[PDB]
Design a protein around this nucleic acid. Structure first.
Lengths: 37, 201, 117, 58, 101
RNA sequence: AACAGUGGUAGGAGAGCGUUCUAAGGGCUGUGAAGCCAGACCGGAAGGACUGGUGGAGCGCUUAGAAGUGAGAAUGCCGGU
RNA sequence: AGUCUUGGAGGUAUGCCAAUGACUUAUCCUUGGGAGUCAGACUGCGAGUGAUAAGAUCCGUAGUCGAAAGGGAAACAGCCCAGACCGCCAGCUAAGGUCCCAAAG
RNA sequence: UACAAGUAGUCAGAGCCCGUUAACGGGUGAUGGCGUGCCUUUUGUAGAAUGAACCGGCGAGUUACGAUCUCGUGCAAGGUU
């Protein structure tokens, strides 16, 4: 395994969900928390 | 496996057996990936820090008055200061199960064996600690790129030489680890260090 | 580490301001109003790409009606006659061309007249 | 036999029961036609939605 | 000059002129042929029931391309609904050859 | 390939685009780097090139890793007008 | 799940149950993870209710909007028709219409 | 462009002036059709609900320790310091 061809095991790493960064991601204005509740 | 024996002069017609349980293991790429990520972390210092909204100088009074009063000149939306979360000093190191570490080192060694990037030397001795002599020896073995040299019990003439050559690193038998094996293209190891590594693992 | 960011903001706003080229006054200068106008233009463009198909048929029908009344028929009777003769495959658009460029298309009106009896 | 059932009207604004009936008939789009064997059950489900469908016999 | 139907649409063609059709498959350099000729105007006129029987218009293919890009953007006020999409509609450039047989 | 489907707020799920840094491999650049200006180019979107001018010394590609990770609204804060 | 069977019981002038046959349909159960929602609005039917016609009064019950653009009702959140993946200067219809504005007698 | 009534665009369209990353090219547009800004909130907004003079920069789901669930890897009745 060379240092420029590192591959993770498929399925071991998931990208974190960043909330509040636009309306196109589904978690925009209300940030997934919806209205007052 | 069996790998041709070699001498400092560069030529040998001998041969040596490598213990298959260490140099014949089928490499486990996922284990090596986690070993690289763990060891390449825990090298980082983590000495970073940012000032909170309460650690910034001033801010007590409510800035306004008249002739209302709302907030603090140090709220995060002011130009003054106050960072919301920012970095904070912390460690990044963690641990793996011991069997995982052993499997990772064995896998890297066997992988390097497969690609013919291993040279087993009868012995590496230097009468004089001259960088020139190490350069001549390295050229004799056709080692033009980054190399790792493994000795038995840390002789000093070899450590002093090759210390200045920009792509060479010298370690002793119990110092080998995943990063300096993967990183350096070639592996020079003495027959005694082979025995020591085999008997440790 | 810290990330500053100015280049992405400048480029993203400049794209909109360049799309707003030709608008009146502040609507080609300030980003906030140019963005609103560009969105409105997108909506209008969709709606009018439908209305264009609506409108050209209306124009074709009007021209056919005129050229048919130049022969003693109306649009409805001529279309019914044309369909009743199988020659109706011919469109409205192609009919209308053969009304500003070859009024010898009256042949078609004669066929419809013959079938309407 | 071999009736052809053609959805002539939309199901928007109709109560749920007729919607379920026409879905069971196999009609999803407006002006869609389907072929069914002639029985009394198929006839009955036809008459329960008769004003939203035209039916002809092969 | 005849009236062809190619792309679920009809066109009026005279020899030598260049037309743009829907994809129409084929490949540059090939000679396409149209069968549904609905009207053969000119000196002798042949209004045909459905299609003029025994009428074919040959043509030559020049290129297969896609038109200028259209940016389809739609949105709903007050509801945070946006949608952006690109579109280039494929065509075929064709030159009319002999408009009979 | 043959069917079937593709309006959408709260919300659930999936796939991606960009930014700074770090590691490995590969490279650019005083015969002109980053940045800035213009254009009638390319992709389904976020976006990406190529030419010309200005600029006068650094930058980017591939695979991974880590985040002070993307602004049009807070009677936001600071500056300019 | 729909519909017809199968039977029966329940009315005094439409229903209820089982039912296992079909013929169409693809749904529904359990466990686990994550939620949002808790002043809805208007219109039409009833005739439950002043059981009558009601208005009431709520009660049900269906639809649409909310979260739905397009055509019609001059204009029109909730009425009528009808559910927008994207292009086309193609065709047939729905509600509603055919003297001119304004497509068609 | 001095007979004209407008969320300022969009679709159709002559005339004039140009000539491009040659492309069913670029600029401006007399006339015709359609068309009540953005955000927040609400059952419902074009409103006499709310906010923003304009431009630029800065500005909000993190980290630590526990609990639980899924996926990956190692070993497995044992696994781990």
């Amino acid at each position: 395994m060379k240092l420029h061809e590192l591959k993770p095991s498929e399925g071991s790493r998931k990208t974190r969900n960043r909330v509040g960064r636009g309306i196109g991601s589904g978690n925009g204005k209300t940030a997934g928390k919806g209205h007052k509740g | 496996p069996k790998v041709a024996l070699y001498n400092q002069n560069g030529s040998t017609a001998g041969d040596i057996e490598l213990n298959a349980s260490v140099f014949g293991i089928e490499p486990n790429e996922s284990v090596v990936f986690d070993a690289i990520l763990m060891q390449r972390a825990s090298l980082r210092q983590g000495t970073h820090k940012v000032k909170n909204r309460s650690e910034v100088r001033g801010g007590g009074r409510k800035p306004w008055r008249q002739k209302a009063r709302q907030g603090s000149i140090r709220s995060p939306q002011w130009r003054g200061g106050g960072v919301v979360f920012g970095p904070t000093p912390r460690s990044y190191s963690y641990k793996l199960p011991k069997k995982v570490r052993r499997l990772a080192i064995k896998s890297v060694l066997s992988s390097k064996v497969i690609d013919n990037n291993i040279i087993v030397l009868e012995d590496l001795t230097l009468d004089t600690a001259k960088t020139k002599e190490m350069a001549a020896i390295l050229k004799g073995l056709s080692v033009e790129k980054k190399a790792l040299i493994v000795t038995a019990d840390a002789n000093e003439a070899v450590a002093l030489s090759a210390r200045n050559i920009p792509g060479v690193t010298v370690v002793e038998a119990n110092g080998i680890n995943v990063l300096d094996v993967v990183n350096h293209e070639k592996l020079l190891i003495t027959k005694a260090a082979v025995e020591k590594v085999e008997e440790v693992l | 580490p810290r990330v500053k960011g100015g280049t992405v903001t400048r480029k993203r706003r400049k794209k909109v301001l360049k799309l707003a080229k030709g608008y009146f006054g502040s609507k080609h200068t300030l980003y906030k109003v140019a963005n609103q106008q560009v969105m409105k233009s997108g909506n209008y463009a969709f709606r009018d790409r439908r209305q264009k198909k609506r409108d050209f048929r209306k124009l074709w029908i009007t021209r056919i009606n005129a050229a048919a009344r130049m022969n003693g028929l109306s649009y409805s009777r001529l279309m019914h006659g044309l369909k009743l003769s199988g020659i109706e495959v011919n469109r409205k658009m192609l009919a209308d061309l053969a009304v500003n460029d070859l009024t010898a298309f009256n042949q078609l009106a004669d066929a419809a007249k013959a079938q309407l009896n | 036999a071999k009736l052809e059932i053609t959805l002539k009207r939309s199901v928007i604004g109709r109560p749920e029961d007729q919607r379920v009936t026409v879905r069971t008939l196999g009609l999803k789009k407006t002006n869609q036609t389907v072929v069914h064997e002639d029985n009394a059950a198929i006839r009955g489900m036809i008459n329960k939605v008769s004003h939203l469908v035209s039916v002809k016999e092969q | 000059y005849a009236i062809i139907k190619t792309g679920g649409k009809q066109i009026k063609v005279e020899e030598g002129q260049t037309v743009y059709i829907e994809k129409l498959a084929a490949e540059a350099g090939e000679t396409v042929t149209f069968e549904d000729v609905l009207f053969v105007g000119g000196d002798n006129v042949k209004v045909g029931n459905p299609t003029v029987e025994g009428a074919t218009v040959t043509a030559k293919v020049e290129k297969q391309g896609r038109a200028k890009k259209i940016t389809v953007f739609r949105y709903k006020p007050k509801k945070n609904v946006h949608k952006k999409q690109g579109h280039r509609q494929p065509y075929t450039k064709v030159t009319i050859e002999k408009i009979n047989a």
